[PDB]
Amino acid sequence: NNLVSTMLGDEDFGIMSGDVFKAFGADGLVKLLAVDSTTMTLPTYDPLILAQIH
Amino acid sequence: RNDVAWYARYPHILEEATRLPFAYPIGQYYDTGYSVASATEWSKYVDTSLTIPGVMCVNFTPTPGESYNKNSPINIAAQNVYTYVRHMNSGHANYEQADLMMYLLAMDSLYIFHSYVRKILAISKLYTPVNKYFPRALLVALGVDPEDVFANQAQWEYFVNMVAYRAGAFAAPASMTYYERHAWMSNGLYVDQDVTRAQIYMFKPTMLWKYENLGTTGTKLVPLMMPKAGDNRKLVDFQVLFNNLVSTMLGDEDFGIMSGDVFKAFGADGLVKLLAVDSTTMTLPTYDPLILAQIHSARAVGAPILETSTLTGFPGRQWQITQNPDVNNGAIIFHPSFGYDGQDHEELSFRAMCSNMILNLPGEAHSAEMIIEATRLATMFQVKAVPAGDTSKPVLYLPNGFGTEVVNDYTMISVDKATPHDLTIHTFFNNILVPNAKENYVANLELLNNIIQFDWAPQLYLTYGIAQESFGPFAQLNDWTILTGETLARMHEVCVTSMFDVPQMG
Amino acid sequence: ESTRNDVAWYARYPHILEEATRLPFAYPIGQYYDTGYSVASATEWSKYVDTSLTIPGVMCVNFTPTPGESYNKNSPINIAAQNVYTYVRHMNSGHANYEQADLMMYLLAMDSLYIFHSYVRKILAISKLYTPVNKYFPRALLVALGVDPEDVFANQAQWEYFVNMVAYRAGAFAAPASMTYYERHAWMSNGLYVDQDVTRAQIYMFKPTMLWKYENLGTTGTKLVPLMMPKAGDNRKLVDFQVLFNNLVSTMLGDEDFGIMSGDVFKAFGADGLVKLLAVDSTTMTLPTYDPLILAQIHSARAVGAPILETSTLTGFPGRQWQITQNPDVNNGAIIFHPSFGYDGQDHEELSFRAMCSNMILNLPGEAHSAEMIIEATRLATMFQVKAVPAGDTSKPVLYLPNGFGTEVVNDYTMISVDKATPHDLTIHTFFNNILVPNAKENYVANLELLNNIIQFDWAPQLYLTYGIAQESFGPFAQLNDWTILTGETLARMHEVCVTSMFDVPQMGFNK
Amino acid sequence: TYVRHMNSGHANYEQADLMMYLLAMDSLYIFHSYVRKILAISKLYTPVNKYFPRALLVALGVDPEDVFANQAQWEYFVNMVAYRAGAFAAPASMTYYERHAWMSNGL
Amino acid sequence: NNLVSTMLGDEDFGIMSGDVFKAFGADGLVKLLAVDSTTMTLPTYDPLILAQIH
Amino acid sequence: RALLVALGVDPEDVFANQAQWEYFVNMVAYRAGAFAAPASMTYYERHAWMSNGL
Amino acid sequence: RNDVAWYARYPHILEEATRLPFAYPIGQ
């Protein structure tokens, strides 16, 4: 609530959000992931992550 | 041995001894008579009366759902609908997001008024010999003089058709299920059971929202009180209420600009459609188990506070949806105080609503849609409103959240057991005070027996004057649960979000 | 679903709907539940906020087995006595040392033995019922029948073998199996009945208030006097029920006329035509069933009050004790059972019995009603007809004479619930259909609590509530569906039909 | 997680209240197995083994004449223990209960 | 009796019993089977029991 | 539990209040997902790659 | 015009209002 206090129900942020929606189409926006009791992530092996952690 | 039964050896004896008249018409007083003929010496100790009620009207008020700041669900909804309308109406628009949302709320109050007068018109056709409450008790519960509707049928039909023609000239999105929900509640007759001598549930708006654009300090939706049951209001009063409702919208330039913008954004197949009415138009009482489940868990919040309300110690607590641009960063604001009963005193029955509610359902398996529809008319108090002053006669409460409508009252219409056996109007909350007088205990018992005739009737919380003690939920429970304010607030915050929802542009 | 289509936000956001509406719905009944406060500062209003929630579990209907208002020779029990004496004595070559009413009072004394066996085998079968979803089982049912629930636990083998030995000693007497009188009283008093066929359902029972104890006179005749059964708070052990059975069959096993009549009924009806009380074992459990006829007659049940004993003191009514008598010198040698109703157990007027002096309402489920449904729904209904005339100048109680009653009458009802105050133990409330509420502040919320406990039961008896502050009664406190006003002659005709049907024997040659 | 969250359970207890309830149920099951072993032992008589059943009954801590003279009361007490244990619920697929029953019921 | 004393009157045990009952069903619960007059245990040979006794 | 301690959350709160946590994260996705952002920017995709992977 | 009778439009009302017990036993 401290993060989105100045954005939820705000007119200027809604104007900018609608403009990004019209410029980049709905298939070209970011998609947040839903979560249920089925949702779990498994530890994967990524050598690109390890090289920049190093 | 023969081993044939006695009832099979003489079936005529059994069929003659058990021929009884059933299906007594309701709407009619019945005297049972005496089994001990000498018992007329006991005057009131022998109750020979039998009155069946027919109408319980749920008196409601449409709300946006407890706006405190700009992060409210109605302000997020205003943002989304203004982004949709603005990026479909390429050009120069002067209104804000909140002017558009307040236009949408005033449109909702218009649609509720149109379905209200259309229900007044469509009830008056209803006749059946086995229910004598049709149609006069349903018209008394809606606050109209029933003889005025019969004597002036063409003027009434013209008035409701012109309400549909005028109020139907402003566009509103039918993708919002808010309007569809109020149309579902506000022009339907609902039986408590799927029988012919069933009892009728109705929804009548207690108040509606009048637009009231003022000065430069935004807009401010103010209450417009509807006729209460027992008022014999005529067509001229409903015409005055209509003209008071659309005084600031008919032939207005800004409302026409917003209406044309909603028309261009949401197409003509995606707007709401008001229903026409003729002499052929009539509504029949249907069986809807979704209506009964939320009538069951309904909790009445009290009377709306107006400017002319004289709350001692509570100034400025009148119910109003405000849009001041210098206050709360120009956010739509609505947070009413509850527990007002029309008078300037304490109303100690509202203390009985300070416990956790019971959510009761039929069956043993409950769907999530079923659970969330059964909680739509429920409203639990959370804290007490702070008295500003030295003394305070009333006690007000603040909820944790409420849905798209709150219940104000219920009105039960039954027949009088004394001659000439005319209708009786009883208005009550979920809470009921019984003060210490002899004329209150048997009357309260009559009212409780009248309420338990209604199948999924709201749960009662009685209190007694000399006992200083409230009794809990007077209702038959089947498969219940105890709700807290946070769970119901989560459900309210979900349902206010779902009702004001529009799609995207792609 | 009239005009509501959907919201369609719940379909594309079903997970938010799922974790927004995740509630527990299956509370085990049998214990107290505190709701809590919505407004947390409402503890300053002590009793003005009700946070208590008590569901009741058991309503026991306390009944008396009756022959059905015999006051002359044209009674149904006297016509049945003439039929059974014609079949046993004349159609089969029977003995000639007894009369037509001796047989019928023997056959009425056998029904008390059968009701006693059904009662103790219900006590035995209840004590093995334990459920997580119902914490009333089995202690509330055992308390409502009047036993110590720990005595049936700690002496289960002695209880079971006592039930079996009662069924074995009942074989020394003979009674015909095709009398549906015995079958009806057994089917009523053996059985737990749910009110709406759910998991956490409410339970209806039938317990005898009293039984008929056979008293042998000289040449004066033959009587059947009440033997009182234990009430719902008595905590009676096995020794009390053994004493009750031993003075129930005391004057029966040593009587020579009962031996002659037992051998006569045995050789008239055969061995396979007799009533057999079947033996139970360690795996015999009763279960709660759903019977809409039982609920139909519980709903239209009218209590008649306490039985009048010979030790009962009633000013102005000296000789009104309940008894099935027979004197060959009095009333042409007819069986006479003509009881006064409206007794509450005290020497004063139960002021609420005035509210039972209006015509009853026969309420039924559905919209179509069979003849058998109407004849079964009126079985426990008993309307008053006239005041009994008091002897002398003054009289404290007010007694009532009916216009016919069925093959059993209801004396009262007993409801078992949990207490709303700590330690939330079981509470026993005994009440008639009429309930008096005296002018005192402690009785109003008590009566309202009793009303809310009663409306939990589905086909509950209709109540009549007299308020002493108002000098006024309110009528039938019930939800009505498809009802009719019933007068005394209609109920009398239905009672005559059922008592004639209950005492009929189809084993006989009567209308082959 | 399974009782409270996967099935819609009540929220007035915690994760350790459930497990201590389920641990208290095992003592009831061990007690029923113990008294039914006491009951089943007392009917074992063999010519080739004169320890039966008095040594087994002494080793369990009972009076071997009390189980003889009160056999019906002992059996119906075992059955009533199994009947009153049905007032509480515990899952059958925990092999904890099955192991303790299989150990304490058996010679 | 003092094993089940604090168990049958406890309200939390009643709630937890109903919860385990509705979660695991009725056939998923532990049933202590009833004995009768002809139920005799017999000595058996189990080499796992001897393996853990040793 | 170690992965929850490293993220700064009381682990028992996530187990005891699983439905409230699921509702909170789904409403964060519903609210924050109402503002558009370009998925052609691989900045968001990189932070999503780093920030919800084990 | 419809010209159907009231008793043919609501026969259930007529059959419910006239269900009376007859054939009372004599001797009583």
Curated annotation (Swiss-Prot), chains A, E:
The 7 kDa polypeptide is acetylated. It comes from the Viruses. Homodimer. The capsid protein self-assembles to form an icosahedral capsid with a T=2 symmetry made of 120 subunits. Picobirnavirus particles are capable of disrupting biological membranes in vitro. This is Capsid protein precursor. It comes from Human picobirnavirus (strain Human/Thailand/Hy005102/-) (PBV). The lineage of its organism: Viruses, Riboviria, Orthornavirae, Pisuviricota, Duplopiviricetes. The gene is Segment-1.
UniProtKB/Swiss-Prot annotation, chain B:
The keyword RNA-binding does not apply. It comes from the Viruses. Gene3D superfamilies: 1.20.140.120. The record marks 22-23 as: Cleavage. It holds the Pfam family PBV_CP. Keywords: Acetylation, Capsid protein, T=3 icosahedral capsid protein, Virion. The 7 kDa polypeptide is acetylated. Autocatalytic proteolysis releases a post-translationally modified peptide that remains associated with nucleic acid within the virion. This peptide is observed only when nucleic acid is packaged in the capsid. The keyword Phosphoprotein does not apply. GO terms for cellular component: T=3 icosahedral viral capsid. Picobirnavirus particles are capable of disrupting biological membranes in vitro. Homodimer. The capsid protein self-assembles to form an icosahedral capsid with a T=2 symmetry made of 120 subunits. This is Capsid protein precursor. It comes from Human picobirnavirus (strain Human/Thailand/Hy005102/-) (PBV). The lineage of its organism: Viruses, Riboviria, Orthornavirae, Pisuviricota, Duplopiviricetes.
